[PDB]
Design a binder for this molecule. Structure first.
Ligand SMILES: CC(C)(COP(=O)(O)OP(=O)(O)OC[C@H]1O[C@@H](n2cnc3c(N)ncnc32)[C@H](O)[C@@H]1OP(=O)(O)O)[C@@H](O)C(=O)NCCC(=O)NCCS
Ligand SMILES: CC(C)(COP(=O)(O)OP(=O)(O)OC[C@H]1O[C@@H](n2cnc3c(N)ncnc32)[C@H](O)[C@@H]1OP(=O)(O)O)[C@@H](O)C(=O)NCCC(=O)NCCS
Ligand SMILES: CC(C)(COP(=O)(O)OP(=O)(O)OC[C@H]1O[C@@H](n2cnc3c(N)ncnc32)[C@H](O)[C@@H]1OP(=O)(O)O)[C@@H](O)C(=O)NCCC(=O)NCCS
Ligand SMILES: CC(C)(COP(=O)(O)OP(=O)(O)OC[C@H]1O[C@@H](n2cnc3c(N)ncnc32)[C@H](O)[C@@H]1OP(=O)(O)O)[C@@H](O)C(=O)NCCC(=O)NCCS
Lengths: 402, 402, 402, 402
């Protein structure tokens, strides 16, 4: 049988067991300083585990991080960031995750979070729990030997070569300004900043010691990697720009790396980069995947918190097959502001809870989910209004991975 | 030393010259019947050529095809499909294309086409001539051994295994119905259908003989090829679905190909495929690039022909650095329909002509162009409205390559 | 409602349907003349099909070939060679195969075949139907620049360079002699020889026209190709050797091919080749897989037909989860000769029907099957004796693929 | 020169010389702690060297380890494990190995070892010295995303996730149980366990730090590595299972590693793994090579120490082209026990000494050696009897590399 236990706080011996299970279940684990940084974000009663039959090792674990997320319009919501989820390879597919998630989401609801959020190791896990893909990350690789900037593109200058660690406060404030105006922005505590700028050798998936370009309103952190042959590439770890000027200035700097063949980055689908070039094909998309996932815990609170770009007057029937967070709601939007209240009236639109989360930061169209029968309406004209309302003011992008 | 001449009709001897230049300039050329099918679509006075010093050969050529394009909301416009553009590698970068395009577009304008359209061999060529990227093709590969359908995805059945050459009329009608509903749709004449279905071994890149799945409301044409090892993959040449049911049923058939490891397709960004699966990541994007380019020749006609997703009342200053097809226009969109009138009033929004063409089928947000200074307004609220209006209710996809 | 239909005889029209379905199901199909050669081996009432709702096409098919298989000891048994098995991708995993196979095996049993045999497109299909892997094919690649023959190894001479198509009868007779002495040998009809020696381009696999080395007591057919780049490679299509002298002579000729880098072949696990070399590592196994599968239809007939390598006296309980061809059998083996009679007596050894087929040509140890609980006995030393008895005195190898 | 000498003991000064030559001759060398552990198993008078001109360095070396090998039937024999064999690249192919081997084997014989054993850097070296390939290692790679366990396969549970360095004694205990039951088993002293469990970075071969699955009756040690693509793979360093249940349970744990694509291991040809799966092809063999080589030093003692699977009464003439350890022997085997006595009687079977060693742990058939004239008889049925007798009841596997 499966009986999860909610740990009031995590003792050192608990973390040792959490690290061991995670390293086995995932196949590797981040360095100790990174683990400690994440652990420091877990609030009370936010760790759910399943002990082995002698109450020694954990065979299942899950926890959440106390976080703050920017939504469309600029409102910042407290959200529970699910993390360190793992079930021992010896105990998988027996309902351990489901048991753990049932308790964990009770804890999250009890604590008042209007949203839970996560990034997923695999794409087929969390839909069934009501999580929708809220942002998309695309891998873009730029051939900097061929790329040229469009004659109209800004060339504002003002970029400096920086030792990142010497500018912790400056970089953190640029990120904060970006965070406040970008849906998907997350508050990034000091511990995370310190770990990033520590730049530990283990931390390197693009090879080599951190470089940084700095601008008044943006920065880019990157690493250079050498091929067997001897061909250099740059991997942008993070590029955060508050203004279009900064974004362009930083890209001009990056594409100015003379002995570098290609520059790559994980970015959002509407990155201005290719529009800045004379030939947009030089900014090559090589992959695209889900990034931030969102489960709406409290539909009225979530829907009223964000802003919209079209008016709407509908009754939504939100289907929740995991918890009871769905039901029928009157959704009335005017002036880009929504009122969303429980109702008994017949629904105009039926929508799966995960779909509602997926649309929440403005990342998808309704017609794809509609084709899949996960969103439905007798009135296809209404569906379009709905999709148009949920569109975003600013392209969404997850501030950092967790 | 460059003087284009316009061919009133294309003689067999003229075409022999055109084929020769095309083959040299491109490095290869389609089969005879294929060429003949395209030639059959060229109207009067629609070919511009530049001969060599002794009028033995052409060292420059360009022509257009008489075509019909579906725009957002369903109006079908006559359009000039530019094709077989080539300048001898011995005469390149001397202004030969520029000279030819100048004359060709004069002809297009005199013939009354509101749009010119093309597909580009490279991405850095046509922006300067006012062409914007109007649709996007993404290469998607599905690991069919791992993909599973979402519990809600339609499973209507009704798919037959077809000899495609035996159902020319049925396939053509399905295509026609898709065409009428989908921006980017192009009328496809009998000659093209015949050539497609002839399935000639040279135009047979990426597999063996065609297979076809047929549904009342859709079809998929595909080929299978072998790895050196002996592993098989399927490449969908064309999948055309009038309804969501047909699209789903066809994908279920393709993903049921037992001995095939992967199924790939060149599709559009908003293909419902990933929404049909339990794990959307299994629909893997491996490339994304420009497909259809559009130059608006007649701003009022083009803007009034399409429907819009939001209402607007602005003055638009359209910059044309190639011809005189821009200027200031009052654009008033009301109930999703536009009146567009030349005016002297000051502008609210400045936009490069190519950008207007690129937005024309709903394929982009405004942010990229704006950041690049290719679309300009002192009111950023206004630009977002403008982008919202130009969105489409149906995802755009070019009917076929030309 | 799956109602299989048995074809009393195959009409040209039926075959047209069979070829269409096979091509869709497999991803392609062998040449018409090859199909015809297989078709010539199908006896009456040996084809079972399932029509589509329209009764136009088949959505399922299966058939068997009338064949003759050599078993350990030299006895030659009539066997039904299952082939052309396919279910339409639109109709799979609905029990169509099971329904067809149920009828087809009823037909096979009524025709009196003691064994049914097949080669499998995938390894997870036929176990559940009682088929065991009876031979193993290993891909072996020899670096002929480095390989050197052991000082003791035969160097008989006697090999000629042949135009194989000019030597059909001589080749055929060498194969026949090999067939009579090798378990797994299949009678190979003139139609198959003719098709092989026709060497139709379609089936070459990128390799060139056939070469053949000829010996009094053996032959090798091989092709050469040069993939990237200019480097040549030889793939042996078939090496059939009646004597050890011929085997060695043929290999010395193959490894004498001066401009060839590597010689490869699909052979059996106990091929003498590496034992002929000073460094056995130069004969590199790169792959290993099931080749021939056998389902014993008549346990007494099958077991009494073959000879055994040790004496035994046991009761077998053979489990058949598909038909009723198992039961308890008294197996008395004396002088390498078996009497197998059904009994009510309690069993010493319990074995799955597929396992019994798998052991039938001497290909496995009992250990793996026992660990997997597919073969069971309290007296573990009795299992070893069972294994010893079922060993062969000549390594088994499938005569040809089908 | 060549004038070898035997070190009575190895001084730190000598060992430094041995490590210098080894590094040069091999192109690299294990860490100091690893060397020390091997050095600790070298008994008296067990190192043969050839000094350079000045006697300040060696230009040739060879030594043996005092070891204990399990043979079929379970007797454990003292054996001499040859290691650190090296000749300076400046002194090679002048007969220095041969000269050293002559003295070393005199020492081995004088010390009383009935067998000498080694693993080979290349496959063509040691057969000439009377060493036969006694065990085979195959690299198997499992696609764990597709692999599924057969419905009959044991599912015993009981597997724990261990920090292997915290369970040295428990792991050693399990290995000792396995090695006593498995021909090829080798006593593994504490020094080797310590070195293995110290898991030094330079020994990890790209993979990360060790994982261990532990069971009451088995363990698996493995590492995980990433690719450029960020995909993970697991390589099993060692899987040691006393029972069938333990073996199945460990593989179930391994194939349960959710984020790993493939799990690989170097195992023996008769590993039960593919028999545990529904599709045996998912356990893909990708390589196969010699592992343990054996030279029989004392034919009567070696042949009498092991047990046999069948009875036999023949005279062997053993050909030894390197020493004089061959001759004619009366081999009488009854009740699986052999008496082997030197004799003048004429032989029924002639066998090269290396072949006798190759057959000694049950790994081969006679067919190959016979075809190569390395094993000879007029009575071909007597050869099969000889082969059946030398078969093993437990599949042989080398305990560890040395
Ligand atoms: C992912 C995870 C914890 C699953 O735990 P689990 O206990 O096996 O899951 P459950 O048994 O509760 O499964 C619940 C349901 O989700 C499904 N599911 C679980 N993991 C899945 C995966 N990786 N992909 C797809 N579906 C999955 C199950 O099939 C089941 O569906 P069903 O209800 O229709 O039967 C586990 O496999 C694991 O530890 N994996 C490694 C990845 C990881 O560490 N965690 C995720 C980081 S985001
Ligand atoms: C493409 C094409 C016909 C160009 O002809 P061309 O006569 O060299 O072009 P022009 O000299 O008139 O060039 C006009 C301008 O476009 C630019 N241009 C032309 N071809 C270009 C290309 N492939 N990429 C980028 N820019 C290009 C020139 O640099 C020039 O810029 P400028 O005005 O600032 O000087 C020619 O290169 C060709 O035939 N190549 C093969 C590709 C092809 O077959 N045609 C297009 C298939 S859609
Ligand atoms: C193999 C094929 C004919 C199966 O037909 P099907 O009608 O889908 O099979 P069924 O529905 O009767 O399946 C029966 C059982 O076999 C199982 N099976 C396992 N692996 C399988 C596989 N690759 N294909 C089909 N069934 C498989 C089914 O899951 C089912 O198991 P269950 O009873 O436990 O649920 C079909 O997949 C096909 O046409 N593939 C091309 C390859 C081929 O034809 N075989 C070559 C002959 S070797
Ligand atoms: C292996 C080793 C020490 C050879 O020393 P050597 O002094 O060159 O050998 P010899 O000259 O005494 O050669 C003896 C015989 O074996 C043969 N031989 C030696 N090395 C061989 C090899 N790598 N492959 C094939 N044959 C070889 C010789 O040709 C010679 O044959 P012959 O008697 O018929 O002429 C040496 O090559 C070396 O140091 N290699 C590096 C790794 C190593 O030693 N391996 C041991 C790991 S088990």
């Amino acid at each position: 049988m499966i009986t999860p236990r909610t740990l009031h706080t995590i003792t050192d011996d608990d973390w040792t067991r959490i690290a061991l299970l995670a390293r086995f279940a995932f196949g590797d684990i981040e360095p100790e300083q990174t683990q400690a940084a994440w652990r420091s974000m877990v609030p009370e009663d936010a760790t759910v585990v399943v002990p082995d039959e002698t109450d020694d090792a954990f065979v299942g674990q899950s926890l959440y991080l106390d976080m703050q997320l920017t939504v469309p319009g600029g409102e910042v919501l407290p959200v529970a960031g699910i993390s360190f989820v793992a079930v021992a390879p010896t105990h998988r597919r027996r309902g351990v995750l489901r048991a753990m998630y049932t308790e964990l989401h009770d804890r999250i609801a009890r604590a008042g979070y209007p949203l839970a959020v996560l990034t997923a190791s695999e794409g087929g896990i969390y839909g069934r729990f009501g999580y929708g893909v809220a942002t998309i990350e695309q891998h873009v690789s730029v051939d900097r030997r061929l790329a040229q900037f469009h004659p109209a593109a800004p060339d504002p200058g003002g970029v400096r070569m920086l030792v990142p660690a010497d500018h912790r406060d400056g970089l953190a404030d640029i990120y904060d300004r970006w965070r406040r105006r970008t849906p998907g922005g997350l508050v990034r505590p000091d511990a995370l900043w310190d770990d990033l700028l520590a730049d530990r050798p283990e931390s390197r998936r693009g090879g080599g010691e951190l470089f940084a370009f700095g601008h008044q309103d943006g920065y880019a952190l990157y690493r250079v990697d050498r091929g067997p042959d001897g061909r250099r590439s740059a991997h942008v770890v993070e590029l955060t720009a508050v203004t279009a000027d900064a974004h362009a200035a930083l890209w001009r700097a990056l594409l100015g790396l003379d002995l570098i063949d290609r520059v790559s980055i994980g970015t959002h689908p509407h990155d201005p980069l290719p529009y800045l070039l004379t030939d947009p094909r030089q900014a090559q998309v090589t992959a695209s995947a889900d990034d931030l996932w969102i489960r709406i815990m409290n539909v009225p609170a979530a829907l009223e918190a964000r802003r919209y770009q079209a008016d709407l007057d509908v009754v939504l029937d939100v289907a929740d097959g995991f918890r009871s967070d769905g039901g029928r709601f009157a959704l009335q939007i005017s002036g880009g502001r929504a009122r969303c209240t429980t109702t008994d009236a017949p629904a105009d639109i039926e929508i799966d809870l995960d779909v509602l989360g997926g649309l929440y930061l403005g990342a998808h169209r309704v017609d794809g989910f509609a084709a899949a029968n996960r969103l439905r309406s007798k009135d296809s004209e209404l569906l379009q209004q709905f999709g148009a309302a949920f569109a975003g003011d600013m392209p969404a992008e997850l501030g950092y991975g967790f």
